[model samples]
Target: GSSGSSGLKDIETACKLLNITADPMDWSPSNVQKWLLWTEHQYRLPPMGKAFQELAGKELCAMSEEQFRQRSPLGGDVLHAHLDIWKSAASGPSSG
Candidate 1:
């Protein structure tokens, strides 16, 4: 199974694309490791969010979970998107 592909920049980009302005200037790696999934999930859901909206809410919230299984019904290549972000975070940004 692939590692979950979500990351900080994805969060930032989501915030940006949605016209969401938050102070990520102070963000650090530790923040990603311990993030409250609910907090992040909330933003990724619809109206204001759609990244994980269909899957994380109360209706499906009670069910058992599995990898990639959620991807189809949830929509988007979110896993791959976050994987790209993860790769970016693992290495420092390019010197360009």
Candidate 2:
């Protein structure tokens, strides 16, 4: 029981690292903007702010790499890479 409980808590902390969640609806537009800012800062890409303005996490997740390009041409690849990391974390572990 202890081990199982510990595992769950670990998962929760990991999820929070990226404000991670399967329900992207839970993320507000402000949260989305903050993430965009943080990701740019962390990756040392060019500044990104209004390029992704007013997006919620669901909207961000729904975007294609090309669409990300349309939004921020310079940082599309980097944004997509970060988005993949966010998506993978949100998906949690897969079982066989």
Candidate 3:
């Protein structure tokens, strides 16, 4: 219910546009970068690419919003929010 591409349609859109799968956990750091690039170009979220450079999708998916926010106050939350959509769209195991 938050962030851009917050619906499944955008997830499908990303899948087609970014050449990635629905599950972020399966993404390599390469896919992560292009996805971040797509998000930045699409949303102008912030230049936080360096903040996420070292992380693959598994690591990205593992981090919390607080961790994301701590990395970059501007786009971190938005990126976290986007990843939440990706996670949900992929039908990953839930926490609550």
Candidate 4:
């Protein structure tokens, strides 16, 4: 359950509560792009991972900020979004 309605204020509190560092650019195409480049250079992974794949007809590559919050392992929405995008892109083209 949430203590208050969703917004930057609540989001920031949630981050502090969970010990997360919030990012300015979250889950947007730019972050995704940056991660792709980073993974390619750092991990030398294939296809910059698979963040932009079609999963059951949804472009799972693009995640909203709220979506990021929902599935954060430790409520690390900002980092989680980046990680999820990176993992997906690195995996490359899944049918799911």
Stretches off by above 4 angstroms in model 4 are 1-25, 49-96
Better by TM-score, candidate 3 or 1: 3
For model 1, which pairs clash? 5-82, 5-83, 45-49, 46-49
User: What is the lDDT ranking, best to worst?
Assistant: 3, 2, 4, 1
What lDDT tens digits, residue by residue, belong to model 2 across residues 1-96?
222222244434434666744333345645666666766887777766677776677777777788788877778888776776555545444521
After superposition on all CA atoms, what RMSD does each candidate show versus the true structure?
11.7, 4.9, 5.4, 13.6
TM-score of each: 0.26, 0.66, 0.78, 0.27
Best by TM-score: 3
Candidate 1 wrongly placed segments (more than 4 Å): 1-40, 43-72
The candidate with the higher TM-score, 1 or 2, is 2
lDDT of 1 at 13: 54
* Candidate 4, run of 10 with poorest lDDT: 52-61
Error at 44, model 2, angstroms:
2.5
Clashing pairs in 3: none
Model 1's lDDT to the true fold?
0.34
Per-residue accuracy of model 4 over 1-96 as CA lDDT, tens digit each: 323222334334434533432332343433344434443454444442244322211233345556544443333254345455333433333533
- The lDDT per prediction is 0.34, 0.62, 0.77, 0.38
